């Protein structure tokens, strides 16, 4: 009742799992060739015809 | 006293969940005449809320 106690710490929890960097690298390289793929889609054929350019007042 | 690790004190910046803090405290001894200092090897921080927790 009068002695000395035990010195005591604490227990963190883990963090969070992250991902290694060299696969997301390669995934926003596919979305950046299907967006271009969108862009020359659109210029190949008959829909981005600039016909109607309104050119006047 | 009881602070930040810098110099910042807990009014200016009051705590978050987790940081880094330090506690110093000071002790004095009387033998008759003056006040002199006391040194024991053994003294206790303890921070509980209900149940202690360091
Ligand atoms: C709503 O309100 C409720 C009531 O106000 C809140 O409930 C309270 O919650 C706290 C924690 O959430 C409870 O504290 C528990 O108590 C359990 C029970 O142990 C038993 O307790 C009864 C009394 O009830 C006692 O008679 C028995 O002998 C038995 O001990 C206990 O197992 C828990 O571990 C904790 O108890 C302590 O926790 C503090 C720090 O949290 C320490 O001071 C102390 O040493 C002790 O154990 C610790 O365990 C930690 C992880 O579990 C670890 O970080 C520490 O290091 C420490 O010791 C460890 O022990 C393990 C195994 O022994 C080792 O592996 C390890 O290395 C290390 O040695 C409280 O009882 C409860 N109150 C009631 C009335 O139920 C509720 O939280 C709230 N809800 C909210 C907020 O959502």
């Known amino acids: 009742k009068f002695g000395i106690k035990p010195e005591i710490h604490h227990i963190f929890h883990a963090e969070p799992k992250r991902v290694a960097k060299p ?13 271009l793929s969108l862009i020359v889609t659109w210029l190949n054929s008959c829909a981005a015809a600039f016909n ?3 050119t006047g007042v | 006293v009881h602070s930040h690790a810098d110099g910042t004190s807990y ?11 330090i506690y110093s405290v000071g002790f004095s001894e009387w033998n008759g005449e003056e006040w002199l200092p006391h040194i024991a090897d053994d003294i206790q921080f303890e921070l509980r809320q209900v149940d202690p927790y360091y």
């Not at chain 2, 009014?11 to 803090?21: F, L, N, Q, R």
């Open chain 2, 11 to 21: 009014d200016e910046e009051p705590y978050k969940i987790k940081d880094k803090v």
């Open chain 1, 52 to 54: 109607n350019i309104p």
């Open chain 1, 23 to 35: 696969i997301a690298v390669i995934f926003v390289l596919i979305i950046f060739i299907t967006i």
